[PDB]
Amino acid sequence: RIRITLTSRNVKSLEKVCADLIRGAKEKNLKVKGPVRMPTKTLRITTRKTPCGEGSKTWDRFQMRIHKRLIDLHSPSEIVKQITSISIEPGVEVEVTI
Amino acid sequence: PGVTVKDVNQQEFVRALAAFLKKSGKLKVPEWVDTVKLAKHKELAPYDENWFYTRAASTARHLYLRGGAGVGSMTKIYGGRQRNGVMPSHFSRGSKSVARRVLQALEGLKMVEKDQDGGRKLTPQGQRDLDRIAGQVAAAN
Amino acid sequence: QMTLRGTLKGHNGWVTQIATTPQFPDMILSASRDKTIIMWKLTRDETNYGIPQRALRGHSHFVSDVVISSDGQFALSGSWDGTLRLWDLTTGTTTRRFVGHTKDVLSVAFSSDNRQIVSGSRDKTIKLWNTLGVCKYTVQDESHSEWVSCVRFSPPIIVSCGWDKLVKVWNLANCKLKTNHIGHTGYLNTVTVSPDGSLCASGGKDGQAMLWDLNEGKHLYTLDGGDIINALCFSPNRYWLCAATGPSIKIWDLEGKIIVDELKQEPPQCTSLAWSADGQTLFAGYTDNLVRVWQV
Amino acid sequence: AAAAAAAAAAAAAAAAAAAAAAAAAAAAAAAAAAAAAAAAAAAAAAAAAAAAAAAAAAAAAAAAAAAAAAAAAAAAAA
Amino acid sequence: SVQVFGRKKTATAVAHCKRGNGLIKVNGRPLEMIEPRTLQYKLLEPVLLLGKERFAGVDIRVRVKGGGHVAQIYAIRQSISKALVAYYQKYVDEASKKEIKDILIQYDRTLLVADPRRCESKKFGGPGARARYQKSYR
Amino acid sequence: GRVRTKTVKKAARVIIEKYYTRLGNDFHTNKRVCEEIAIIPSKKLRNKIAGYVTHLMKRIQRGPV
Amino acid sequence: QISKKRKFVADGIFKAELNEFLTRELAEDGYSGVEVRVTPTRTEIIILATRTQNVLGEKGRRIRELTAVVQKRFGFPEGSVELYAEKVATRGLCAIAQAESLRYKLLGGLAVRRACYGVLRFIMESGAKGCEVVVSGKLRGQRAKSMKFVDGLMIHSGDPVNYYVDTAVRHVLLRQGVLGIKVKIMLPWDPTGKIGPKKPLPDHVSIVEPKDEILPTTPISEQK
RNA sequence: UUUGUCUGGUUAAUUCCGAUAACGAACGAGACUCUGGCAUGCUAACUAGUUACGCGACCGGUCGGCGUAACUUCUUAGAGGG
């Protein structure tokens, strides 16, 4: 019961590496339960635009999304080293616990 | 038919359970039930001096519907709106003294036990004592 | 000598195809642009000829074709999502799901015997399917350079049509390009195979069904009809090989190659042509959401 | 032949030792190299020889972003 | 057996409708036991409109969450009507579905068709979406 | 206001000059036609191009434009 | 331990301070940006520069010095950081490198106009579609004003200014004040993605040409 | 330096039609990104739920009451459709 946990700020690299990891685990046919899409946390900081406070008080709205996914599989726990060597694309980082 | 709390009108049932919690005489009444305010937002003491039995009645009905609750969730149920004078109004929590003393006084007549998770729940005997009162409001129309 | 017998409404969308039954005289399948497949029960009644019995909704987008099984409760359909589903009409269920196209199915076909599914689609492919929901053959198969508007069977060929104007003749279960018939100016919309299995009338943009022989591969006739063809379909017993033009249905009579008559009713367009297999029933589907019935 | 250019070399790195960076795909049959005119030291851009164009790409890919004298090595088709 | 929702707002109601001897229960209380009673006819509107004979084979259990009280009522009646029409299309013949849909749609279209209106966001410079602050000149 | 801008009624006309043998009077056929015959970025331009070639084929077959 | 959000924020602050410090040291090197790639054998930091021979120093002294100072300042462990130099293909399509080049020409001193026209001529000779350079400040006399140098076309609004437009703002310190140098470059299309963006502009309707087919004008078959 | 960019009709818009010594265009508008509204069609899942069960508690019904096997309607969120 080893669960690999993926996190990024963009959806497309995370979707490519999750598709590649389930393709590498469906080619060897371990039991893989599919990607479980955890809800996105928006970090929003709403600051004022003007550096001295003189104008017509227009406000500025920043945000950043965190996309949080996982794959869970039942296997021997040293077979699991060979799948996480194809997943080294930037953005997405991998946290593994048992 | 079979009559539980969830199938009947909830304006008369709490007052009939308050009539049973008056008429048995086995609910203890502590010494300060007649001089207290019931949170920091209310203005006055109750109109009717039978507020303790009515409050214990509704409290056991709330333990009928959702158990796994404690005093700190009983104050989340029993909060209200604070008028603050010239400031805006606020939501301010209910009193833990009344909920602690009502729930221990309902444990005193073997009607109420604690939960496995530390908060509260009903007994089978306290389940029986409320479904019979639902069965007795069920005929009064 | 063909007379229009009325109207049928369950519909909110444009009719594409009508599929009817030899074992069941009172039962139609009507697929349409209301994204459903309707089991109709023909009561053959005075005010409303047949009424809606069961409407099957499994598709996200426009259904283009329905075909029925040997013993119908089972039907195979295709739609503009690109997939095919298997429907038992008594339960109404989607028994199996046939993914593996990339783009929209334009026309499908059933066989008489066991275990043959062909279907043609917009993504320049032709596929043969097993009933397993797994493909019968490995598909690289050097298909049409345009959309495949129709594919048909003969009761051992695959016969197709296209938007690159060469119709085809293929072999069943080797998927080869065996005979290649180039006569058309304009894209090909609808062909048909006659209920013996020898003839191909091949019609299209130009409104011209070119009459082929399917057993030998030779152009036998030329029939210069009307406006743009939506359908070619047979009589079962009468050897007419009639066609459905835009404002009208054209009948031919191949003894003289004479028109019997025209079938009269921007006009709404006739999009469907099917005879129930006893004869003397002529079904026509329209874009103002009537379904029309023609008897002798 | 197969021609492609390599860059970002070093002064203490010599041509006989630079052959072992790309020898995993093919061993270069020559070494042609620019050197400077004032010092006669390494001008550090050159044209290395591989034999076939299949060797020209597969040498190039691993050598790209490979660590040479704490740098990310450079290749382009020429 | 169907379960088919109806929503007005962030209030969401879904009725669980399977075969039986007649039932309506919204989260375990029946339809005559919901708190707002100036709006009592809104939940009863399929019962008054379709009649109790049209419900005569089903056991409908409604589970609600979210929203306010009135949006919850307007999701209850829509989920009940969609429950009976989804049961009628799957298990009864479709002319009965045609009769029930013209008797339900022509009265009120929120019984079968949802509400696409949601609350539009506040923007700056004023206390609501459109309203703006008082803007003294002198 | 629903007025079509320069690209959705110049690009629709340069789509109509060639490729007239594929176009027709129904919108849903021409909407599916427009991705084989062009390279258009995303679909709202493509639905607007398809709406103008359907309106232009509604206009054009009864006289000169 | 620490949150996911505070981890993402603190790594973003690491990118910000690393790019700001590397700009403040490396003016001469052609510094345009940095690239982090982290694997737990060794955490890899890749610098973008057009001239590597000033990145190294004396036989690679400053790149091992840079490894040492990033190891010391951010609390990095002994032997998990090594430092590379990636060669950028086009100096004329990176606004940071050309902004430094105009800054170095004007700081080493030139006429302002012949500096800006050399920059605009090199950018339009490198293969971009367009450019705009504003050098503003105490240009002529003691009253400051705007001087704009454009050539070609520029896109200004919408979402495609985020992937078709490269910009940079830099400061140059002269004896009587500061002057402000902006370089905005539009990139060319380059449909494979070789030196330019993959998706086209969203208003740019490209029509494939029709195939030249002659009609058959007879019904005719062919076997095999 | 001017016409192109206008008498007029139309548009939320120099947005378009039309007139026409102008013809074709570029920036701005529009397109585009994000959000809202739809899906019994796909992908689906003990940090999410439905329901058929098995048992406990209460006079067939109630249980956010305790744990199991099929599904993706309700939750999450992608790929396309619209």
JSON list of N, CA and C in Angstrom, two decimals, chain C residues 26-79:
[
{"chain": "C", "resi": 26, "resn": "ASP", "atom": "N", "xyz": [-45.03, -3.28, -36.27]},
{"chain": "C", "resi": 26, "resn": "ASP", "atom": "CA", "xyz": [-45.55, -2.06, -35.66]},
{"chain": "C", "resi": 26, "resn": "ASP", "atom": "C", "xyz": [-44.48, -1.28, -34.90]},
{"chain": "C", "resi": 27, "resn": "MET", "atom": "N", "xyz": [-43.21, -1.51, -35.21]},
{"chain": "C", "resi": 27, "resn": "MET", "atom": "CA", "xyz": [-42.12, -0.99, -34.40]},
{"chain": "C", "resi": 27, "resn": "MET", "atom": "C", "xyz": [-41.08, -0.36, -35.30]},
{"chain": "C", "resi": 28, "resn": "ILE", "atom": "N", "xyz": [-40.77, 0.90, -35.02]},
{"chain": "C", "resi": 28, "resn": "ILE", "atom": "CA", "xyz": [-39.83, 1.69, -35.78]},
{"chain": "C", "resi": 28, "resn": "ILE", "atom": "C", "xyz": [-38.72, 2.08, -34.81]},
{"chain": "C", "resi": 29, "resn": "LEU", "atom": "N", "xyz": [-37.51, 2.26, -35.31]},
{"chain": "C", "resi": 29, "resn": "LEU", "atom": "CA", "xyz": [-36.51, 3.06, -34.63]},
{"chain": "C", "resi": 29, "resn": "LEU", "atom": "C", "xyz": [-36.33, 4.36, -35.40]},
{"chain": "C", "resi": 30, "resn": "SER", "atom": "N", "xyz": [-36.44, 5.48, -34.71]},
{"chain": "C", "resi": 30, "resn": "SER", "atom": "CA", "xyz": [-36.16, 6.78, -35.32]},
{"chain": "C", "resi": 30, "resn": "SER", "atom": "C", "xyz": [-35.04, 7.43, -34.54]},
{"chain": "C", "resi": 31, "resn": "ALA", "atom": "N", "xyz": [-33.89, 7.62, -35.19]},
{"chain": "C", "resi": 31, "resn": "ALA", "atom": "CA", "xyz": [-32.78, 8.36, -34.61]},
{"chain": "C", "resi": 31, "resn": "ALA", "atom": "C", "xyz": [-32.81, 9.78, -35.15]},
{"chain": "C", "resi": 32, "resn": "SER", "atom": "N", "xyz": [-32.43, 10.73, -34.31]},
{"chain": "C", "resi": 32, "resn": "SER", "atom": "CA", "xyz": [-32.63, 12.12, -34.67]},
{"chain": "C", "resi": 32, "resn": "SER", "atom": "C", "xyz": [-31.62, 13.02, -33.97]},
{"chain": "C", "resi": 33, "resn": "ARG", "atom": "N", "xyz": [-31.73, 14.31, -34.26]},
{"chain": "C", "resi": 33, "resn": "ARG", "atom": "CA", "xyz": [-30.92, 15.37, -33.68]},
{"chain": "C", "resi": 33, "resn": "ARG", "atom": "C", "xyz": [-31.53, 15.93, -32.40]},
{"chain": "C", "resi": 34, "resn": "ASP", "atom": "N", "xyz": [-32.47, 15.21, -31.79]},
{"chain": "C", "resi": 34, "resn": "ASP", "atom": "CA", "xyz": [-32.84, 15.43, -30.40]},
{"chain": "C", "resi": 34, "resn": "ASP", "atom": "C", "xyz": [-32.06, 14.52, -29.46]},
{"chain": "C", "resi": 35, "resn": "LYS", "atom": "N", "xyz": [-30.98, 13.93, -29.98]},
{"chain": "C", "resi": 35, "resn": "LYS", "atom": "CA", "xyz": [-29.95, 13.16, -29.29]},
{"chain": "C", "resi": 35, "resn": "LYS", "atom": "C", "xyz": [-30.47, 11.89, -28.64]},
{"chain": "C", "resi": 36, "resn": "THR", "atom": "N", "xyz": [-31.64, 11.40, -29.04]},
{"chain": "C", "resi": 36, "resn": "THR", "atom": "CA", "xyz": [-32.20, 10.17, -28.50]},
{"chain": "C", "resi": 36, "resn": "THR", "atom": "C", "xyz": [-32.57, 9.19, -29.60]},
{"chain": "C", "resi": 37, "resn": "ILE", "atom": "N", "xyz": [-32.82, 7.95, -29.19]},
{"chain": "C", "resi": 37, "resn": "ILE", "atom": "CA", "xyz": [-33.31, 6.89, -30.06]},
{"chain": "C", "resi": 37, "resn": "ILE", "atom": "C", "xyz": [-34.66, 6.46, -29.52]},
{"chain": "C", "resi": 38, "resn": "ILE", "atom": "N", "xyz": [-35.68, 6.47, -30.38]},
{"chain": "C", "resi": 38, "resn": "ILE", "atom": "CA", "xyz": [-37.05, 6.28, -29.93]},
{"chain": "C", "resi": 38, "resn": "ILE", "atom": "C", "xyz": [-37.57, 4.95, -30.45]},
{"chain": "C", "resi": 39, "resn": "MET", "atom": "N", "xyz": [-38.01, 4.10, -29.53]},
{"chain": "C", "resi": 39, "resn": "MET", "atom": "CA", "xyz": [-38.85, 2.95, -29.85]},
{"chain": "C", "resi": 39, "resn": "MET", "atom": "C", "xyz": [-40.27, 3.45, -30.06]},
{"chain": "C", "resi": 40, "resn": "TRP", "atom": "N", "xyz": [-40.77, 3.35, -31.28]},
{"chain": "C", "resi": 40, "resn": "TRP", "atom": "CA", "xyz": [-42.12, 3.79, -31.60]},
{"chain": "C", "resi": 40, "resn": "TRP", "atom": "C", "xyz": [-43.01, 2.58, -31.75]},
{"chain": "C", "resi": 41, "resn": "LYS", "atom": "N", "xyz": [-44.21, 2.64, -31.19]},
{"chain": "C", "resi": 41, "resn": "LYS", "atom": "CA", "xyz": [-45.21, 1.59, -31.40]},
{"chain": "C", "resi": 41, "resn": "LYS", "atom": "C", "xyz": [-46.29, 2.11, -32.33]},
{"chain": "C", "resi": 42, "resn": "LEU", "atom": "N", "xyz": [-46.37, 1.49, -33.50]},
{"chain": "C", "resi": 42, "resn": "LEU", "atom": "CA", "xyz": [-47.34, 1.91, -34.48]},
{"chain": "C", "resi": 42, "resn": "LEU", "atom": "C", "xyz": [-48.66, 1.26, -34.12]},
{"chain": "C", "resi": 43, "resn": "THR", "atom": "N", "xyz": [-49.62, 2.06, -33.70]},
{"chain": "C", "resi": 43, "resn": "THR", "atom": "CA", "xyz": [-50.96, 1.54, -33.45]},
{"chain": "C", "resi": 43, "resn": "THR", "atom": "C", "xyz": [-51.78, 1.53, -34.74]},
{"chain": "C", "resi": 44, "resn": "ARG", "atom": "N", "xyz": [-51.26, 2.19, -35.78]},
{"chain": "C", "resi": 44, "resn": "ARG", "atom": "CA", "xyz": [-51.85, 2.36, -37.11]},
{"chain": "C", "resi": 44, "resn": "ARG", "atom": "C", "xyz": [-53.25, 2.97, -37.00]},
{"chain": "C", "resi": 45, "resn": "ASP", "atom": "N", "xyz": [-53.30, 4.08, -36.28]},
{"chain": "C", "resi": 45, "resn": "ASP", "atom": "CA", "xyz": [-54.55, 4.63, -35.80]},
{"chain": "C", "resi": 45, "resn": "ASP", "atom": "C", "xyz": [-54.94, 5.84, -36.63]},
{"chain": "C", "resi": 46, "resn": "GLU", "atom": "N", "xyz": [-56.18, 6.27, -36.42]},
{"chain": "C", "resi": 46, "resn": "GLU", "atom": "CA", "xyz": [-56.81, 7.30, -37.22]},
{"chain": "C", "resi": 46, "resn": "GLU", "atom": "C", "xyz": [-56.18, 8.68, -36.98]},
{"chain": "C", "resi": 47, "resn": "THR", "atom": "N", "xyz": [-56.10, 9.10, -35.71]},
{"chain": "C", "resi": 47, "resn": "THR", "atom": "CA", "xyz": [-55.59, 10.43, -35.39]},
{"chain": "C", "resi": 47, "resn": "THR", "atom": "C", "xyz": [-54.07, 10.51, -35.32]},
{"chain": "C", "resi": 48, "resn": "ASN", "atom": "N", "xyz": [-53.43, 9.63, -34.57]},
{"chain": "C", "resi": 48, "resn": "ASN", "atom": "CA", "xyz": [-51.98, 9.57, -34.46]},
{"chain": "C", "resi": 48, "resn": "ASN", "atom": "C", "xyz": [-51.58, 8.16, -34.87]},
{"chain": "C", "resi": 49, "resn": "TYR", "atom": "N", "xyz": [-50.74, 8.05, -35.89]},
{"chain": "C", "resi": 49, "resn": "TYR", "atom": "CA", "xyz": [-50.48, 6.76, -36.53]},
{"chain": "C", "resi": 49, "resn": "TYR", "atom": "C", "xyz": [-49.68, 5.83, -35.62]},
{"chain": "C", "resi": 50, "resn": "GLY", "atom": "N", "xyz": [-48.57, 6.31, -35.07]},
{"chain": "C", "resi": 50, "resn": "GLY", "atom": "CA", "xyz": [-47.87, 5.59, -34.01]},
{"chain": "C", "resi": 50, "resn": "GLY", "atom": "C", "xyz": [-47.36, 6.52, -32.93]},
{"chain": "C", "resi": 51, "resn": "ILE", "atom": "N", "xyz": [-47.35, 6.02, -31.69]},
{"chain": "C", "resi": 51, "resn": "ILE", "atom": "CA", "xyz": [-47.07, 6.85, -30.51]},
{"chain": "C", "resi": 51, "resn": "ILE", "atom": "C", "xyz": [-45.72, 6.50, -29.90]},
{"chain": "C", "resi": 52, "resn": "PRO", "atom": "N", "xyz": [-45.05, 7.40, -29.16]},
{"chain": "C", "resi": 52, "resn": "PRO", "atom": "CA", "xyz": [-43.76, 7.06, -28.53]},
{"chain": "C", "resi": 52, "resn": "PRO", "atom": "C", "xyz": [-43.90, 6.02, -27.42]},
{"chain": "C", "resi": 53, "resn": "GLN", "atom": "N", "xyz": [-43.18, 4.90, -27.57]},
{"chain": "C", "resi": 53, "resn": "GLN", "atom": "CA", "xyz": [-43.12, 3.86, -26.55]},
{"chain": "C", "resi": 53, "resn": "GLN", "atom": "C", "xyz": [-41.92, 3.95, -25.63]},
{"chain": "C", "resi": 54, "resn": "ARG", "atom": "N", "xyz": [-40.72, 4.19, -26.16]},
{"chain": "C", "resi": 54, "resn": "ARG", "atom": "CA", "xyz": [-39.53, 4.25, -25.32]},
{"chain": "C", "resi": 54, "resn": "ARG", "atom": "C", "xyz": [-38.48, 5.09, -26.02]},
{"chain": "C", "resi": 55, "resn": "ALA", "atom": "N", "xyz": [-37.93, 6.07, -25.33]},
{"chain": "C", "resi": 55, "resn": "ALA", "atom": "CA", "xyz": [-36.95, 6.97, -25.91]},
{"chain": "C", "resi": 55, "resn": "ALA", "atom": "C", "xyz": [-35.63, 6.80, -25.17]},
{"chain": "C", "resi": 56, "resn": "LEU", "atom": "N", "xyz": [-34.61, 6.35, -25.88]},
{"chain": "C", "resi": 56, "resn": "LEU", "atom": "CA", "xyz": [-33.34, 5.98, -25.27]},
{"chain": "C", "resi": 56, "resn": "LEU", "atom": "C", "xyz": [-32.34, 7.13, -25.38]},
{"chain": "C", "resi": 57, "resn": "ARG", "atom": "N", "xyz": [-31.82, 7.60, -24.25]},
{"chain": "C", "resi": 57, "resn": "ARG", "atom": "CA", "xyz": [-30.90, 8.74, -24.26]},
{"chain": "C", "resi": 57, "resn": "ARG", "atom": "C", "xyz": [-29.57, 8.29, -23.67]},
{"chain": "C", "resi": 58, "resn": "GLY", "atom": "N", "xyz": [-28.60, 8.05, -24.55]},
{"chain": "C", "resi": 58, "resn": "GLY", "atom": "CA", "xyz": [-27.25, 7.70, -24.15]},
{"chain": "C", "resi": 58, "resn": "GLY", "atom": "C", "xyz": [-26.15, 8.55, -24.73]},
{"chain": "C", "resi": 59, "resn": "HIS", "atom": "N", "xyz": [-26.49, 9.50, -25.58]},
{"chain": "C", "resi": 59, "resn": "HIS", "atom": "CA", "xyz": [-25.47, 10.23, -26.31]},
{"chain": "C", "resi": 59, "resn": "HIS", "atom": "C", "xyz": [-25.44, 11.70, -25.94]},
{"chain": "C", "resi": 60, "resn": "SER", "atom": "N", "xyz": [-24.23, 12.26, -25.97]},
{"chain": "C", "resi": 60, "resn": "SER", "atom": "CA", "xyz": [-24.02, 13.66, -25.68]},
{"chain": "C", "resi": 60, "resn": "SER", "atom": "C", "xyz": [-24.31, 14.56, -26.86]},
{"chain": "C", "resi": 61, "resn": "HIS", "atom": "N", "xyz": [-24.31, 14.03, -28.08]},
{"chain": "C", "resi": 61, "resn": "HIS", "atom": "CA", "xyz": [-24.43, 14.85, -29.27]},
{"chain": "C", "resi": 61, "resn": "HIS", "atom": "C", "xyz": [-25.13, 14.00, -30.33]},
{"chain": "C", "resi": 62, "resn": "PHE", "atom": "N", "xyz": [-25.29, 14.59, -31.52]},
{"chain": "C", "resi": 62, "resn": "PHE", "atom": "CA", "xyz": [-26.23, 14.19, -32.57]},
{"chain": "C", "resi": 62, "resn": "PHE", "atom": "C", "xyz": [-26.04, 12.75, -33.01]},
{"chain": "C", "resi": 63, "resn": "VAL", "atom": "N", "xyz": [-27.10, 11.95, -32.88]},
{"chain": "C", "resi": 63, "resn": "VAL", "atom": "CA", "xyz": [-27.11, 10.58, -33.35]},
{"chain": "C", "resi": 63, "resn": "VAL", "atom": "C", "xyz": [-27.37, 10.59, -34.85]},
{"chain": "C", "resi": 64, "resn": "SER", "atom": "N", "xyz": [-26.57, 9.84, -35.60]},
{"chain": "C", "resi": 64, "resn": "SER", "atom": "CA", "xyz": [-26.69, 9.84, -37.05]},
{"chain": "C", "resi": 64, "resn": "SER", "atom": "C", "xyz": [-27.30, 8.58, -37.64]},
{"chain": "C", "resi": 65, "resn": "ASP", "atom": "N", "xyz": [-27.25, 7.44, -36.93]},
{"chain": "C", "resi": 65, "resn": "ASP", "atom": "CA", "xyz": [-27.67, 6.17, -37.51]},
{"chain": "C", "resi": 65, "resn": "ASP", "atom": "C", "xyz": [-28.08, 5.19, -36.42]},
{"chain": "C", "resi": 66, "resn": "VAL", "atom": "N", "xyz": [-29.11, 4.37, -36.70]},
{"chain": "C", "resi": 66, "resn": "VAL", "atom": "CA", "xyz": [-29.51, 3.20, -35.90]},
{"chain": "C", "resi": 66, "resn": "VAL", "atom": "C", "xyz": [-29.78, 2.02, -36.83]},
{"chain": "C", "resi": 67, "resn": "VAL", "atom": "N", "xyz": [-29.36, 0.81, -36.41]},
{"chain": "C", "resi": 67, "resn": "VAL", "atom": "CA", "xyz": [-29.58, -0.44, -37.15]},
{"chain": "C", "resi": 67, "resn": "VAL", "atom": "C", "xyz": [-30.06, -1.48, -36.14]},
{"chain": "C", "resi": 68, "resn": "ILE", "atom": "N", "xyz": [-30.92, -2.41, -36.58]},
{"chain": "C", "resi": 68, "resn": "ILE", "atom": "CA", "xyz": [-31.53, -3.39, -35.67]},
{"chain": "C", "resi": 68, "resn": "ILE", "atom": "C", "xyz": [-30.94, -4.77, -35.95]},
{"chain": "C", "resi": 69, "resn": "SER", "atom": "N", "xyz": [-31.03, -5.65, -34.94]},
{"chain": "C", "resi": 69, "resn": "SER", "atom": "CA", "xyz": [-30.49, -7.01, -34.88]},
{"chain": "C", "resi": 69, "resn": "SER", "atom": "C", "xyz": [-31.38, -8.00, -35.64]},
{"chain": "C", "resi": 70, "resn": "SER", "atom": "N", "xyz": [-30.96, -9.28, -35.64]},
{"chain": "C", "resi": 70, "resn": "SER", "atom": "CA", "xyz": [-31.80, -10.35, -36.16]},
{"chain": "C", "resi": 70, "resn": "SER", "atom": "C", "xyz": [-33.14, -10.42, -35.44]},
{"chain": "C", "resi": 71, "resn": "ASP", "atom": "N", "xyz": [-33.14, -10.62, -34.14]},
{"chain": "C", "resi": 71, "resn": "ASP", "atom": "CA", "xyz": [-34.38, -10.51, -33.38]},
{"chain": "C", "resi": 71, "resn": "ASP", "atom": "C", "xyz": [-34.31, -9.22, -32.58]},
{"chain": "C", "resi": 72, "resn": "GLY", "atom": "N", "xyz": [-35.02, -8.19, -33.06]},
{"chain": "C", "resi": 72, "resn": "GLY", "atom": "CA", "xyz": [-34.90, -6.94, -32.33]},
{"chain": "C", "resi": 72, "resn": "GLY", "atom": "C", "xyz": [-35.55, -6.87, -30.97]},
{"chain": "C", "resi": 73, "resn": "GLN", "atom": "N", "xyz": [-34.67, -6.80, -29.98]},
{"chain": "C", "resi": 73, "resn": "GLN", "atom": "CA", "xyz": [-34.64, -5.88, -28.88]},
{"chain": "C", "resi": 73, "resn": "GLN", "atom": "C", "xyz": [-33.32, -5.14, -28.90]},
{"chain": "C", "resi": 74, "resn": "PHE", "atom": "N", "xyz": [-32.34, -5.67, -29.62]},
{"chain": "C", "resi": 74, "resn": "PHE", "atom": "CA", "xyz": [-30.98, -5.18, -29.64]},
{"chain": "C", "resi": 74, "resn": "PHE", "atom": "C", "xyz": [-30.81, -4.30, -30.85]},
{"chain": "C", "resi": 75, "resn": "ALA", "atom": "N", "xyz": [-30.12, -3.18, -30.66]},
{"chain": "C", "resi": 75, "resn": "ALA", "atom": "CA", "xyz": [-29.83, -2.26, -31.74]},
{"chain": "C", "resi": 75, "resn": "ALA", "atom": "C", "xyz": [-28.45, -1.68, -31.56]},
{"chain": "C", "resi": 76, "resn": "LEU", "atom": "N", "xyz": [-27.81, -1.39, -32.68]},
{"chain": "C", "resi": 76, "resn": "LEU", "atom": "CA", "xyz": [-26.52, -0.72, -32.68]},
{"chain": "C", "resi": 76, "resn": "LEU", "atom": "C", "xyz": [-26.64, 0.65, -33.34]},
{"chain": "C", "resi": 77, "resn": "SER", "atom": "N", "xyz": [-26.16, 1.68, -32.65]},
{"chain": "C", "resi": 77, "resn": "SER", "atom": "CA", "xyz": [-26.31, 3.07, -33.06]},
{"chain": "C", "resi": 77, "resn": "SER", "atom": "C", "xyz": [-24.95, 3.74, -33.17]},
{"chain": "C", "resi": 78, "resn": "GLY", "atom": "N", "xyz": [-24.97, 4.96, -33.69]},
{"chain": "C", "resi": 78, "resn": "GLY", "atom": "CA", "xyz": [-23.76, 5.76, -33.76]},
{"chain": "C", "resi": 78, "resn": "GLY", "atom": "C", "xyz": [-24.12, 7.22, -33.76]},
{"chain": "C", "resi": 79, "resn": "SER", "atom": "N", "xyz": [-23.19, 8.04, -33.30]},
{"chain": "C", "resi": 79, "resn": "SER", "atom": "CA", "xyz": [-23.52, 9.42, -33.02]},
{"chain": "C", "resi": 79, "resn": "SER", "atom": "C", "xyz": [-22.31, 10.30, -33.24]}
]
